[PDB]
Every structure is written in structure tokens, then in C-alpha cells.
Short mmCIF file of C-alpha atoms and ligand atoms in Angstrom, two decimals:
data_model
loop_
_atom_site.label_atom_id
_atom_site.label_comp_id
_atom_site.label_asym_id
_atom_site.label_seq_id
_atom_site.Cartn_x
_atom_site.Cartn_y
_atom_site.Cartn_z
CA UNK Y 1 112.22 94.11 98.31
CA UNK Y 2 113.67 95.63 101.33
CA UNK Y 3 116.31 93.58 103.04
CA UNK Y 4 120.09 94.19 103.62
CA UNK Y 5 120.46 98.03 103.85
CA UNK Y 6 123.58 99.25 104.82
CA UNK Y 7 123.34 102.91 104.43
CA UNK Y 8 120.50 105.41 103.07
CA UNK Y 9 122.25 106.57 99.87
CA UNK Y 10 119.64 105.47 97.16
CA UNK Y 11 117.43 108.18 98.37
CA UNK Y 12 119.81 110.59 96.86
CA UNK Y 13 117.50 109.56 93.82
CA UNK Y 14 115.10 112.43 92.26
CA UNK Y 15 112.76 111.33 95.25
CA UNK Y 16 109.37 113.05 94.97
CA UNK Y 17 108.79 115.25 98.03
CA UNK Y 18 105.02 116.66 98.80
CA UNK Y 19 105.51 120.71 98.10
CA UNK Y 20 102.85 120.64 100.85
CA UNK Y 21 103.88 118.63 104.07
CA UNK Y 22 107.33 118.06 102.86
CA UNK Y 23 107.22 114.40 103.06
CA UNK Y 24 108.25 111.93 100.05
CA UNK Y 25 105.05 110.79 98.30
CA UNK Y 26 105.10 106.93 98.32
CA UNK Y 27 103.03 104.87 96.00
CA UNK Y 28 101.46 107.40 94.01
CA UNK Y 29 102.12 111.30 93.66
CA UNK Y 30 99.66 113.84 91.87
CA UNK Y 31 101.19 116.31 89.44
CA UNK Y 32 99.84 119.41 89.50
CA UNK Y 33 100.98 122.88 87.97
CA UNK Y 34 104.36 121.22 87.58
CA UNK Y 35 104.44 119.78 90.95
CA UNK Y 36 104.44 117.65 93.61
CA UNK Y 37 101.59 117.02 96.33
CA UNK Y 38 99.82 113.94 98.13
CA UNK Y 39 96.24 112.90 97.51
CA UNK Y 40 95.16 114.50 100.56
CA UNK Y 41 97.24 117.58 100.92
CA UNK Y 42 95.49 118.74 97.05
CA UNK Y 43 92.24 119.24 98.57
CA UNK Y 44 89.87 121.92 99.17
CA UNK Y 45 91.21 124.54 102.11
CA UNK Y 46 87.47 124.68 103.60
CA UNK Y 47 85.81 121.37 103.93
CA UNK Y 48 89.38 119.79 103.05
CA UNK Y 49 87.39 117.49 100.42
CA UNK Y 50 89.22 115.48 97.44
CA UNK Y 51 88.36 117.21 94.15
CA UNK Y 52 86.76 114.98 91.70
CA UNK Y 53 88.43 114.03 88.46
CA UNK Y 54 85.50 116.02 86.26
CA UNK Y 55 84.20 119.09 88.23
CA UNK Y 56 86.15 122.28 88.34
CA UNK Y 57 88.27 123.69 90.89
CA UNK Y 58 88.92 127.13 91.44
CA UNK Y 59 92.40 129.15 92.14
CA UNK Y 60 92.58 131.00 95.10
CA UNK Y 61 95.77 132.22 95.56
CA UNK Y 62 97.83 129.35 97.38
CA UNK Y 63 94.87 127.27 98.15
CA UNK Y 64 92.05 126.40 96.25
CA UNK Y 65 88.46 125.39 97.21
CA UNK Y 66 85.43 123.12 95.67
CA UNK Y 67 82.93 124.35 93.74
CA UNK Y 68 80.33 123.48 96.56
CA UNK Y 69 82.39 126.12 99.04
CA UNK Y 70 83.49 128.52 96.10
CA UNK Y 71 80.10 128.56 95.33
CA UNK Y 72 77.27 130.38 97.70
CA UNK Y 73 75.46 127.44 100.21
CA UNK Y 74 71.90 127.86 102.07
CA UNK Y 75 74.02 126.72 105.24
CA UNK Y 76 77.23 128.47 106.06
CA UNK Y 77 79.50 128.82 108.84
CA UNK Y 78 82.38 127.90 110.88
CA UNK Y 79 84.34 124.44 110.23
CA UNK Y 80 85.37 121.98 112.83
CA UNK Y 81 88.95 121.85 114.26
ZN1 ZN U 101 101.70 116.60 101.55
ZN1 ZN U 102 85.15 122.50 100.26
#
């Protein structure tokens, strides 16, 4: 638990920080390409959807896209803000 914290040195520990938003990943971390990212940060760049544990993932420079997006869709256009 957390009771009786005098200072903030314990942090010194390795500590896993997301290489996306630059924030400590509490609970669980997603190890990808020998790095650390959040469960919501390591998502598509267009639709921003979480890649399934099965389907494949396309690699585009820095950001990745989902099969759905990567592939041609009958209905395409600008996404919400
Ligand atoms: Zn993040
Ligand atoms: Zn997508």
C-alpha cells in the first residue's frame, strides 16, 4: 500500500515510461520493438483502434495502421477531431 511516504526517491527504480505520451505506465505495459507503450497509445493512427491479438499490423514509418485502414475501403474520408 501507500501510507507514510516521506519523499519520492523510490521512483528512481527502473520505472516503465511510455515512449509515446511520456508518462509512467501503471498496471500493465505493452512491450513492442523492445520499447514501452500504453494500451491506448499503441493503436492505429487513423481510426485509433486497438490492434487485435491475431490480425496483422502494418508498419508505416513511426505510426502503424490497422488492416482495415491499410486496406482499401468502400467508404473513406476525413476522421473526427
Ligand atoms: Zn502513452
Ligand atoms: Zn485503423
